[PDB]
Design an enzyme around this catalytic site. Structure first.
Site, PDB file in Angstrom:
ATOM      1  N   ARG A 175       1.424   5.944  -0.134  1.00 12.86           N
ATOM      2  CA  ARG A 175       1.273   7.205   0.172  1.00 12.86           C
ATOM      3  C   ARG A 175       1.641   7.928  -1.129  1.00 12.86           C
ATOM      4  O   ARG A 175       2.238   7.401  -2.006  1.00 12.86           O
ATOM      5  CB  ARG A 175       1.870   7.822   1.347  1.00 12.86           C
ATOM      6  CG  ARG A 175       1.330   9.120   1.800  1.00 12.86           C
ATOM      7  CD  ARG A 175       2.357   9.520   2.770  1.00 12.86           C
ATOM      8  NE  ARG A 175       3.450  10.360   2.104  1.00 12.86           N
ATOM      9  CZ  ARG A 175       4.694  10.201   2.499  1.00 12.86           C
ATOM     10  NH1 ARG A 175       5.246   9.553   3.680  1.00 12.86           N
ATOM     11  NH2 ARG A 175       5.816  10.930   1.677  1.00 12.86           N
ATOM     12  N   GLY A 176       1.343   9.196  -0.962  1.00 10.89           N
ATOM     13  CA  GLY A 176       1.707  10.152  -2.129  1.00 10.89           C
ATOM     14  C   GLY A 176       0.946   9.946  -3.308  1.00 10.89           C
ATOM     15  O   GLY A 176      -0.035   9.085  -3.398  1.00 10.89           O
ATOM     16  N   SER A 177       1.060  10.993  -4.159  1.00 13.58           N
ATOM     17  CA  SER A 177      -0.088  11.266  -5.359  1.00 13.58           C
ATOM     18  C   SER A 177       0.107  10.090  -6.131  1.00 13.58           C
ATOM     19  O   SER A 177      -0.950  10.014  -6.878  1.00 13.58           O
ATOM     20  CB  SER A 177       0.505  12.340  -6.047  1.00 13.58           C
ATOM     21  OG  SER A 177       0.367  13.455  -5.471  1.00 13.58           O
ATOM     22  N   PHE A 178       1.417   9.341  -6.256  1.00  8.56           N
ATOM     23  CA  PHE A 178       1.087   8.159  -7.357  1.00  8.56           C
ATOM     24  C   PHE A 178       1.488   6.675  -6.643  1.00  8.56           C
ATOM     25  O   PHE A 178       1.326   5.848  -7.411  1.00  8.56           O
ATOM     26  CB  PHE A 178       2.455   8.502  -8.248  1.00  8.56           C
ATOM     27  CG  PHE A 178       2.299   9.780  -8.799  1.00  8.56           C
ATOM     28  CD1 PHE A 178       1.800  10.129 -10.127  1.00  8.56           C
ATOM     29  CD2 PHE A 178       3.331  10.830  -8.534  1.00  8.56           C
ATOM     30  CE1 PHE A 178       1.852  11.042 -10.862  1.00  8.56           C
ATOM     31  CE2 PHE A 178       3.363  12.201  -9.210  1.00  8.56           C
ATOM     32  CZ  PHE A 178       2.742  12.026 -10.200  1.00  8.56           C
ATOM     33  N   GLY A 179       0.901   6.894  -5.391  1.00  8.39           N
ATOM     34  CA  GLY A 179       1.044   5.709  -4.623  1.00  8.39           C
ATOM     35  C   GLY A 179       2.354   5.271  -4.630  1.00  8.39           C
ATOM     36  O   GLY A 179       2.799   4.010  -4.485  1.00  8.39           O
ATOM     37  N   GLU A 180       3.534   6.235  -4.640  1.00 11.37           N
ATOM     38  CA  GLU A 180       4.916   5.776  -4.793  1.00 11.37           C
ATOM     39  C   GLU A 180       5.764   5.689  -3.529  1.00 11.37           C
ATOM     40  O   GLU A 180       6.933   5.574  -3.721  1.00 11.37           O
ATOM     41  CB  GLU A 180       5.571   6.842  -6.002  1.00 11.37           C
ATOM     42  CG  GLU A 180       6.013   8.051  -5.326  1.00 11.37           C
ATOM     43  CD  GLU A 180       5.066   9.031  -5.037  1.00 11.37           C
ATOM     44  OE1 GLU A 180       3.798   8.731  -5.104  1.00 11.37           O
ATOM     45  OE2 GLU A 180       5.368  10.157  -4.860  1.00 11.37           O
ATOM     46  N   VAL A 181       5.088   6.141  -2.545  1.00 11.20           N
ATOM     47  CA  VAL A 181       5.784   6.122  -1.245  1.00 11.20           C
ATOM     48  C   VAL A 181       5.451   4.803  -0.481  1.00 11.20           C
ATOM     49  O   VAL A 181       4.034   4.757  -0.307  1.00 11.20           O
ATOM     50  CB  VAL A 181       5.665   7.482  -0.595  1.00 11.20           C
ATOM     51  CG1 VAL A 181       6.366   7.506   0.737  1.00 11.20           C
ATOM     52  CG2 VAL A 181       5.968   8.476  -1.287  1.00 11.20           C
TER      53      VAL A 181
ATOM     54  N   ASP B  59       7.074  22.599  -4.919  1.00 12.83           N
ATOM     55  CA  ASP B  59       5.531  21.777  -4.752  1.00 12.83           C
ATOM     56  C   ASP B  59       5.216  21.857  -3.311  1.00 12.83           C
ATOM     57  O   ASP B  59       4.885  20.815  -2.798  1.00 12.83           O
ATOM     58  CB  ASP B  59       5.526  20.490  -5.416  1.00 12.83           C
ATOM     59  CG  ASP B  59       4.314  19.775  -5.845  1.00 12.83           C
ATOM     60  OD1 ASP B  59       3.272  20.565  -5.990  1.00 12.83           O
ATOM     61  OD2 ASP B  59       4.209  18.665  -5.788  1.00 12.83           O
TER      62      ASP B  59
ATOM     63  N   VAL C 126       0.854  -1.134  -0.193  1.00 10.49           N
ATOM     64  CA  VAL C 126       0.032   0.139  -0.116  1.00 10.49           C
ATOM     65  C   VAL C 126       0.846   1.186   0.020  1.00 10.49           C
ATOM     66  O   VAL C 126       2.072   1.227   0.476  1.00 10.49           O
ATOM     67  CB  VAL C 126      -1.057   0.080   1.101  1.00 10.49           C
ATOM     68  CG1 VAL C 126      -1.763  -1.461   1.141  1.00 10.49           C
ATOM     69  CG2 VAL C 126      -0.350   0.310   2.581  1.00 10.49           C
TER      70      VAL C 126
END
EC number: 2.7.11.25
Length: 315
Positions: free
Chosen positions: A63-69, A170, A61
């Site tokens: 976090r982050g905008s792209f589910g990259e974290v 950002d 699972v």
């Protein structure tokens, strides 16, 4: 050219090293190599490979905008931290060069970075309070004192960066991470960073960005104030009022100061207005706004509202 020479010994290998060494290697990233900056993450026999030497939490699972974290664990040490996955083909040198060697309680510690195949894996401290973005969603919106408190801390992070001629690029709630008790906030994610002398979140874009004008540190101040509005209202500015190509509206329209809640204290409203001046030269700097925001927090009686607490309805 001597810098170029030292980079060769680093290439093709993952080592435990210092920040400057990671920055120099990162410059070549435009098949397993990198530098780990904390003893909590350890290479094994010149390598540090996903699912071999480090593993992501449970079923994956993000976090982050792209589910990259992701949460991850070093298999040798047992140490838990966060990894941000970046596509090599899109990797910007500044994401590591702008932040390697920084030391501030207002900036999330960099733990290292390792290239593996088409991935650049960036490791960093896991802040178990989650992101300010997650908090806004979880709570609906934030009371004024807490919003000012986090804006203040973000602006202290920005002071530290701007003094060192680094544009974050950002500034938004998703890019502010919180300690487990909510008392400490820190800037993260330098994907859009620029060293002063590539688009961030559109709702948070300053007019000079959208108009293709020359950009300086003031862009972070506008963005931080869009983040303030997001905190108070539970939604991004320009979410209501405008329903088309958004970039044009940012250019042509007045600053979104009409989104300041009427119930906000006068100095809170004043601070947000000075951070949202359309012309950069008129906009408050990180230091000026940080002092104003600190005073504004004092003016509403300091930080009193509960960490988490009660769901407040978004505007």
């Amino acid at each position: 050219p001597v810098e170029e020479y030292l980079v060769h010994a680093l290439q093709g290998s993952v080592s435990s090293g210092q920040a400057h060494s990671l920055a120099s290697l990162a410059k070549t990233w435009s098949d397993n190599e990198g530098v780990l900056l904390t003893e909590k993450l350890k290479p094994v026999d010149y390598e540090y490979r996903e699912e071999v030497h480090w593993m992501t939490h449970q079923p994956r699972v993000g976090r982050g905008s792209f589910g990259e974290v992701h949460r991850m664990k070093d298999k040798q040490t047992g140490f838990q931290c966060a990894v941000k996955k970046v596509r090599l083909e899109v990797f910007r040198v500044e994401e590591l060069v702008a932040c390697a060697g920084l030391s501030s309680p207002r900036i999330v510690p960099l733990y290292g970075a390792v290239r593996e195949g088409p991935w650049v894996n960036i490791f960093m401290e896991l802040l178990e309070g989650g992101s300010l973005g997650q908090l806004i969603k979880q709570m609906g919106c934030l009371p004024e004192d807490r919003a000012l408190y986090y804006l203040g801390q973000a602006l202290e992070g920005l002071e530290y960066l701007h003094t060192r001629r680094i544009l974050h690029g950002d500034v938004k709630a998703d890019n502010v991470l919180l300690s487990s008790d909510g008392s400490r906030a820190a800037l993260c994610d330098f994907g859009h960073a620029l060293c002063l002398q590539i688009p961030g979140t559109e709702t948070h874009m300053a007019p000079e960005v959208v108009m293709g004008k020359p950009c300086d540190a003031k862009v972070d101040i506008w963005s931080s104030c869009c983040m303030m509005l997001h905190m108070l209202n539970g939604c991004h500015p320009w979410t209501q009022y405008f329903r088309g190509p958004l970039c044009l509206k940012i250019a042509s329209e007045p600053p979104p100061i009409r989104e300041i809640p009427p119930s906000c204290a006068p100095l809170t409203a004043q601070a947000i207005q000075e951070g949202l001046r359309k012309e950069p030269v008129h906009r408050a700097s990180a230091m000026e706004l940080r002092r104003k925001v600190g005073k504004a927090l004092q003016e509403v009686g300091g930080l009193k509202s509960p960490w988490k607490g009660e769901y407040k309805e978004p505007r």
